[PDB]
Write a protein that binds this DNA or RNA. Structure first.
Length: 84
DNA sequence: CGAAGGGTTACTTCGCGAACACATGCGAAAAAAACATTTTTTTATAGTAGCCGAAAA
């Protein structure tokens, strides 16, 4: 739902939320948060896009059968982006 | 009669003090040399960076 202190110390906290049981260790949103929204949200996104970037590098490296020349082809593509 | 050898007074620039108590060798280019890294041969061992599948809705 949103960030709100539902309950604690009595049962599974449910005042304004979508939780219905205890042992919330799995995903660990439980009560509410009011600290570091966007700078901590856009960190796993950056990590995930860099991992997909390295995976598509590993996929492109199958075609050109030269590893370090594929790395120089990558930096040649990014300096084509630089001249763009 | 005129150029030259001391001889001094005159203008300018450099050395000290101001009470008497109280309680607050240094820096910077390089150069011979004693020296470690860095290996690769495993290799026992835990896990810690990073990677997809069987599980739930």
């Amino acid at each position: 739902k949103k960030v709100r202190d539902g309950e604690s110390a009595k049962y599974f906290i449910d005042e304004e939320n979508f939780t219905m049981a205890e042992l919330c260790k799995p995903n660990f949103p439980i009560g509410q948060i009011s600290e570091n929204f966007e700078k901590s949200k856009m960190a796993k996104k950056a990590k995930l896009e860099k991992r997909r970037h390295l995976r598509e590098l590993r996929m492109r490296a199958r075609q050109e059968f030269k590893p370090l020349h594929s790395l120089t082809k990558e930096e040649q593509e990014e300096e084509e982006e630089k001249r763009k």
